[PDB]
Amino acid sequence: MVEIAINPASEITATSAFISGTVTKGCNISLLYWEASNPMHVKVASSISKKDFPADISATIKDLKPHTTYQFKVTVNFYFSSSLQTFKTLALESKSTSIV
């Protein structure tokens, strides 16, 4: 009886990513993210209580492990889960300035 839209992650860096979703048709909405190898170690990008539908939830999750695969979903009222989206962080990278 509820519809959830989840978007692929954008603005992905070595240690951060931007995840978003939308609920279209007092209820809780949460962005839940975790690294692929540890779906138990699950963190919360955002928690909002909108009674107003449709609803947009966004969060720029920081402090991520470089070069690591993460997954995130959107959960409504703690039991109604949407589908998964998958992304992987970048590794650390520098400004190499060679001399020739």
Side-chain angles (χ1 to χ4, degrees), residues 12-15 66-67 89-96:
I12 299 138
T13 46
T15 47
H67 198 235
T89 50
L90 282 177
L92 301 176
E93 291 147 10
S94 302
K95 184 198 286 186
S96 165

Side-chain angles (χ1 to χ4, degrees), residues 37-59:
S37 57
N38 204 340
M40 281 286 103
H41 188 172
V42 61
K43 305 196 146 205
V44 177
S46 161
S47 193
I48 58 170
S49 87
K50 286 185 183 295
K51 50 199 171 302
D52 316 317
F53 288 175
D56 275 357
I57 187 156
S58 314

Side-chain angles (χ1 to χ4, degrees), residues 7-27:
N7 315 121
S10 66
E11 302 162 45
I12 299 138
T13 46
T15 47
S16 63
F18 182 77
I19 58 185
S20 48
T22 299
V23 177
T24 42
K25 296 285 95 175
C27 311

Side-chain angles (χ1 to χ4, degrees), residues 52-73:
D52 316 317
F53 288 175
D56 275 357
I57 187 156
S58 314
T60 180
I61 47 182
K62 298 181 180 184
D63 212 328
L64 294 176
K65 307 196 183 301
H67 198 235
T68 307
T69 304
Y70 281 93
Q71 288 176 322
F72 67 102
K73 59 168 175 168

